[PDB]
Each structure stands twice: as structure tokens, then as C-alpha cells.
């Protein structure tokens, strides 16, 4: 509603082509597409797409706001792209990167091999610092969630894979 | 006088082909059972099979409203130690698509030998094609 | 002999 | 967590959500106030 009644300013190499209910976008970083819901209406007046509720359906405004939000961060990803920073707190934890397959050494007994999607690239400046660079926000967020879910943060030492400036509350060991 | 009765040698049966794509399950099944018993013909007889042969194409694409695609459970019992087997609508559509249509129609038919014969009239396929092209199946839309 | 009997 | 028939706001930061058709209470400030089934 308040989200959906605000059009999205689409900048710099827009390529926002429509096919029925499908939105395809080429951009600076790449190309992202999605099939939208059937209760939403998109329109390409005034250089910038506007979202209305389609007739007949009950849930119009929430679907339209969800559509506006996903297309907004989607076209933001095709403009400049999303990044995610993970760090490894804890001794014996190294995170060397081999191309498209991250090889974590979280010290279970064996290495951890992690195949990436076709989109997100990964870089390590130091050995406790993974930086994911990808356009599609859900895929980089999902792969950061998988990499954290290999080994969670510990509430006693702070040991584990964690997000960058996310604060972990460590209870002291009684 | 006596009322008219049909005779099983002179009843003249038609062939129909029904595309079951994108339709509701039980509405289609009710129309199928009505056509199978013969209640659409004027010379209806309750002990003579009057109905027609129906070829139901595309049993894969049948639809169910609500959350029945994941939660309509089919129960059947193997007649054994304590094995009550069960399968939802999704794995029944994937594993054995024609069984959904045949179960829905067989629940709607009379029980007895006449109902089993009028169920043998029904021929359910999951593809778009059938091998019954030698009987000229007319399109029965519903 | 009261073994089968309900006594 | 606490599976209960009565879920209430124990804390200032716990919000009441309805996930998967069940009523749950999430406190982001402490995990002892997490509860279910209300």
C-alpha cells in the first residue's frame, strides 16, 4: 500500500522488458528475471514502473508491495550489486577460496567444500574474511546463510562463522 | 400396457473423448459418472447399462481447489498384519495419475456387477494421445 | 472339582 | 522453547507472529521468551 504507491526510479541501462507477467532486466552487473504474481499490475509510464492492484483478487496491496520491493532490490542488484561480508571468529578457522568452491577449514575433522551458484563470486582478503559479491539478493543471502549454517556462532567464546558487524551476545559460563 | 425397458443387444453406445486439463476433480468425475451410467439418454433403464464409452485424456493436469493438492490423503489397506498404507494427492498424481480419476469415478458409481461393467466403459489416460482412433471419439466438452 | 466352574 | 496453550508478551521486545498457522512469540533480546502453540 504505502510501499506499493511509490514508483521505482529505474536508472542507467534499464532493459526492463515485460512479457505477460514476467519481468526481465539486463544491467551493469548482469541479468535478473522473475514471474510476478497475478494480483499485481505493472506499468511503464513516465520512465519508471508503477504497481497497482489487479481487479478481482482480495490480496492486492500486499502482493503489489512485495512486487515493488523485490523488483526494487533486483534492479539495484543489476545496477551496482549486493555484497555480503562474513568473518570467522575462532582459532584454527581458515577460509581459503578455490575459484567457485569455498574450502572452509572449520576444524571438524575434514575440509568443507562449498559449491557456489553461477552468480556469486567470492574473495578472501585475509583468511578469516569471506566477501560474497552478487547481483541477486536472495541468492547471496541464501549462500551466506548456508555458509553460516555450516558452523553457527558459539554463545561462550564467540567461535563460529558470523556476519560482519552483527553482534553476538555471549553468556558467561556460569 | 407396460413401460419401456431397454434391451442389452439393441442399445447403441457412443464414444467420447474428454480433455481433463485444468478442470476440477469432482465436478468432472460427476459428469463422467452421469454419462457412464446412461442417465442422459431418454431410454434409461436401471438394470441395463445405457451409458457411453469415455476416453479421459490428460489425467495429469486435473486440478483441486484449496490445499487439497497436498492434503487429500488416499487410504487403502493391504489386508495384512496392520499395514494401512496412505498416499496424498501429490504422490498419487506423480506415481499413478489415472488412479485419481478412476477412484473418483468408482466412488460415484453403483456397486454391483452392473457398476463394474459401467466402470469398464471408462478409459483414463494421462497423456494427450490415445490409441482409440478407430472408434471415432467425438469431443464431449464440459 | 471347581476349576472350570465359575464359583 | 515453551509449548503452551497461552502465549503472552513476557518481554518488551517480543513480537507475536502467526507462522504456519500457529501463534508464536519471538523475543530478539533473549531466547528464553520464545514460545509456541498459543
Amino acid at each position: 500500500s504505502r510501499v506499493a504507491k511509490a514508483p521505482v526510479v529505474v536508472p542507467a541501462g534499464v532493459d526492463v522488458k515485460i512479457n505477460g507477467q514476467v519481468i526481465t532486466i539486463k544491467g551493469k552487473n548482469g541479468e535478473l528475471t522473475r514471474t510476478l504474481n497475478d494480483a499485481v499490475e505493472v506499468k511503464h509510464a513516465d520512465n519508471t514502473l508503477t504497481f497497482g492492484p489487479r481487479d478481482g483478487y482480495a490480496d492486492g496491496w500486499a502482493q503489489a508491495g512485495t512486487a515493488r520491493a523485490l523488483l526494487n532490490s533486483m534492479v539495484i542488484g543489476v545496477t551496482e550489486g549486493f555484497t555480503k561480508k562474513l568473518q570467522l571468529v575462532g582459532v584454527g578457522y581458515r577460509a581459503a577460496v578455490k575459484g567457485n568452491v569455498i574450502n572452509l577449514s572449520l576444524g571438524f575433522s575434514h575440509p568443507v567444500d562449498h559449491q557456489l551458484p553461477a552468480g556469486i563470486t567470492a574473495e578472501c582478503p585475509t583468511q578469516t574474511e569471506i566477501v560474497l559479491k552478487g547481483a541477486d539478493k536472495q541468492v547471496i543471502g541464501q549462500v551466506a546463510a548456508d555458509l553460516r549454517a555450516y558452523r553457527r556462532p558459539e554463545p561462550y567464546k564467540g567461535k563460529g562463522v558470523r556476519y560482519a558487524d552483527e553482534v553476538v551476545r555471549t553468556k558467561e559460563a556460569k | 400396457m407396460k413401460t419401456f425397458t431397454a434391451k442389452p443387444e439393441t442399445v447403441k453406445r457412443d464414444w467420447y473423448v474428454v480433455d481433463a486439463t485444468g478442470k476440477t476433480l469432482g465436478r468432472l468425475a460427476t459428469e463422467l459418472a452421469r454419462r457412464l451410467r446412461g442417465k442422459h439418454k431418454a431410454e434409461y433403464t436401471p438394470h441395463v447399462d445405457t451409458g457411453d464409452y469415455i476416453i479421459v485424456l490428460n489425467a495429469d493436469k486435473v486440478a483441486v481447489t484449496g490445499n487439497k493438492r497436498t492434503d487429500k490423503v488416499y487410504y487403502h489397506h493391504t489386508g495384512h498384519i496392520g499395514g494401512i498404507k496412505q498416499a496424498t494427492f501429490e504422490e498419487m498424481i506423480a506415481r499413478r495419475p489415472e488412479r485419481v480419476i478412476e477412484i473418483a469415478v468408482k466412488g460415484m458409481l453403483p456397486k454391483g456387477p452392473l457398476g463394474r461393467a459401467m466402470f469398464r466403459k471408462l478409459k483414463v489416460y494421462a497423456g494427450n494421445e490415445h490409441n482409440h482412433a478407430a472408434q471415432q471419439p467425438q469431443v464431449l466438452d464440459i | 472339582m471347581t476349576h472350570s466352574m465359575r464359583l | 522453547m515453551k509449548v503452551r496453550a497461552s502465549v503472552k508478551k513476557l518481554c518488551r521486545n517480543c513480537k507475536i507472529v502467526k507462522r504456519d498457522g500457529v501463534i508464536r512469540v519471538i523475543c530478539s533480546a533473549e531466547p528464553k521468551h520464545k514460545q509456541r502453540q498459543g
Binding site: - | G79, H80, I81, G82 | - | -
Partner: protein
């Protein structure tokens, strides 16, 4: 890959030079000639059909005579099929000897087990014999109780009772091959395979790897 059909020829033991003795079953694996090849054009599934051995020319009926003389092979006893798992192509009349089992390490042997006849519940289902003394009356190796009472009111299906024991198809899995003789067309496997001596065995490579 496919299995081969052989014959159970006794049991012996071989002595490894380390000192260990291992019991082997010797399987005479004769030349298996492929009679008919199934493919998914006509049949819907792909397979091969093999035969082995020999039969009397007067003991062969004209149906199986014509079926053998259709494609290149000679009369053996029995016909068997093998299911060709993804990537084998065999011409009819192709002799298949025991070199594929010279490569392999574990094996599955399928045979018809020895028929123990009408057996009781003690022999068939390892039931516990009741008391031999302390009062017992005509009920030493009887099966006990077979059901509860009025509430089921019936015996359950699959209740273990007496009946035919033996004489059925049994597969034994993961038997180690210890030696393959190609000039004798023999196969030594470790352990015991189902059947009497001289019974026909089916030898497939192991699936539970």
C-alpha cells in the same frame, strides 16, 4: 554389468600362503551364448537372453528348436535374462566367459535352495519348543497360540505357521571372489551358495557396493 549362469560343483577350501584357509564354492561357468536381445523398440526394456550347457537333440521341442535356430546359437538347458544396465550392447551368439568376473571383487549368487519339505514351526520359524516334562500333554513342538480372542476373532494374515520349507529362490549378496580360472572355466567364491551340488546358479556382480 550382467551376470553369468553356472553350476554348483561342490565345496572345498583353499589355503592362502599366509596360513589362512578359506572355504570356496566352485562354480562351473560354461560359455554363455546370447540367444535373443531385447531392446526398448519392441519390448520397452532392454535385456539379453542367454543359455548354457547342452541338451539331447531328441529332447528338444520344435518351439525351442526354432527359437535356438533363429539366431546363431545351439541348444542349452534353460534360458535366462539379464537386464543390461545402461551401456552394454551384445550381438546374438556372443560367447560370454568368466573374464568379467576376473575383474570384479564381490558377487551375488542366486539359486534355488534345498527343499526341506513340509517343516514345522520349530524348523521353519525358529519357534521355541515348550516343556518336555512338568506335566506337558501332547504339546511339545506344537505352535502354541495362533491368535488372541473375540476382538480380532480371526487369525492374522502372515501368521507364521508350518508348511513348505526350502525349494525357493534365495540370493546371497557380497561374496568375495577368490580365484577365476579361465582354462577350466571355473569360479571360486568364498562361502556357501544356495542349492544342492549340481544346481544351476546365477552369478551377478554385487549391487550393494
Amino acid at each position: 554389468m550382467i551376470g553369468l549362469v553356472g553350476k554348483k560343483v561342490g565345496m572345498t577350501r583353499i589355503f592362502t600362503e599366509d596360513g589362512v584357509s578359506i572355504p570356496v564354492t566352485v562354480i562351473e561357468v560354461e560359455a554363455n551364448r546370447v540367444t535373443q536381445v531385447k531392446d526398448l523398440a519392441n519390448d520397452g526394456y532392454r535385456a539379453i537372453q542367454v543359455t548354457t550347457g547342452a541338451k539331447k537333440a531328441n529332447r528338444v521341442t520344435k518351439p525351442e528348436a526354432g527359437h535356438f535356430a533363429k539366431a546363431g546359437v545351439e541348444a542349452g538347458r534353460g534360458l535366462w535374462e539379464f537386464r543390461l544396465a545402461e551401456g552394454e550392447e551384445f550381438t546374438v551368439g556372443q560367447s560370454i566367459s568368466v573374464e568379467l568376473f576376473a575383474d570384479v571383487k564381490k558377487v551375488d549368487v542366486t539359486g534355488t535352495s534345498k527343499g526341506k519339505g513340509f517343516a514345522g514351526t520349530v524348523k521353519r520359524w525358529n519357534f521355541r519348543t515348550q516343556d518336555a516334562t512338568h506335566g506337558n500333554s501332547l504339546s511339545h513342538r506344537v505352535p502354541g497360540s495362533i491368535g488372541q480372542n473375540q476382538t480380532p476373532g480371526k487369525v492374522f494374515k502372515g501368521k507364521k505357521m508350518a508348511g513348505q520349507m526350502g525349494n525357493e529362490r534365495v540370493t546371497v549378496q557380497s561374496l568375495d571372489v577368490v580365484r577365476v580360472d579361465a582354462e577350466r572355466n571355473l569360479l571360486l567364491v568364498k562361502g556357501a551358495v544356495p542349492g544342492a551340488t549340481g544346481s544351476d546358479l546365477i552369478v551377478k556382480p554385487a549391487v550393494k557396493a
